[PDB]
Amino acid sequence: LTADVLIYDIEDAMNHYDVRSEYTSQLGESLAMAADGAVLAEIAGLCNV
Amino acid sequence: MVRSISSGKSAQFPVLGRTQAAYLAPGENLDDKRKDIKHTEKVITIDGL
Amino acid sequence: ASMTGGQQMGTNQGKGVVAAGDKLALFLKVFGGEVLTAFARTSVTTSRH
Amino acid sequence: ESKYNENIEGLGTATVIETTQNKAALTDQVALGKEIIAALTKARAALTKN
């Protein structure tokens, strides 16, 4: 499982904010989210379905 | 020219012009006549890389 | 009683723009000092796993 | 452009055409220079008036 971000440099030229740390954090939260949802689905269905 | 600017997307410059210099006949009003000053800018947008 | 020759700081003016509806019009929308980040999403891991 | 200049009628530009002379019969490499000289004088003056 993964998360990926590509950014045209020409936009980082004219930006007027950071977006680095924010991007990183969002990737991490995406990871954790995927894990939790996957698990819950698995127990719920796979145990009793 | 060549005047340089960082940060944002596009650039623009303000301009203005002339004046009207009139005598003030003593014992009269300074608020009597003002045609003020015209105000407009010209805009320039960069092209990608 | 309004005062004409109001000097019209911001305005289009120019020549052939006609219009001249209201004011600003010409000006710069500027915020460079802060960002709006999306929401932190909590999780159930590890804990009860 | 068309009909659009800057700062009301306050200022304005122009492009000076050659006065009563043709491009076809030209490229004689002599009359050309003279024509361009006088026309350029007219251009300079037209600038000064602005």
| Residue of C30, C31, C39 lying closest to A22 (CA atoms) | C39
**Residues 6 or more apart in contact with residue C3 via CB below 8 angstroms:** B31
CB-count exposure of residue D24 (10 Å: 0-12, 13-18, 19+): exposed
To the nearest whole Å, the CA of B41 is away from the closest chain C CA by 8
Interface mutation target, options C9, C15, C17, C26, chain B, most CBs of B under 10 Å: C26
Contact residues, chain C, for B41 at CB < 8 Å: 26
CB D32 within 8 A of CB D26: yes
Residue A15, CB-side half-sphere exposure with 13 Å CA sphere: 13
Task: Give the position of tokens 């932190």.
Answer: C40
Nearest chain A Cα distance for residue B14, angstroms: 21
Q: What is the resolution of this structure in A?
A: 3.6
Q: Which residues in chain C have Cβ-Cβ distances shorter than 8 Å to B36? A: 5-8
Method underlying the structure: cryo-EM
Q: Are B16 and C14 in contact (CB under 8 A)?
A: no
* Pairwise CA distance, residues C34 & C15, whole Å: 38
Locate tokens 């490229």: which residue?
Answer: D27
CB hemisphere CA count around C37 (13 angstroms): 15
Give CA–CA dist B46/A13, Å, rounded: 12
B35 CA to centre of own chain: 14
The CA distance from A25 to A20, in Å, is: 9
User: Could you tell me which residues are beta bridge partners of residue B15?
Assistant: B40
Within 10 angstroms of residue C14's Cβ, the number of other Cβ atoms is 22
Q: Say whether B8 and A14 touch across the interface (CB within 8 A).
A: yes
Nearest to D19 by CA among D3, D41, D1: D41
- The SS3 of residue C12 is coil
Minimum Cα–Cα distance from D8: chain B residue? B38
Pairwise CA distance, residues B13 & B42, whole Å: 6
Q: What's the N-to-C CA distance of chain B in angstroms? A: 20
Residue numbers in D near B40 (CB within 8 A): 6-7
CB contact B20 to C (< 8 Å): no
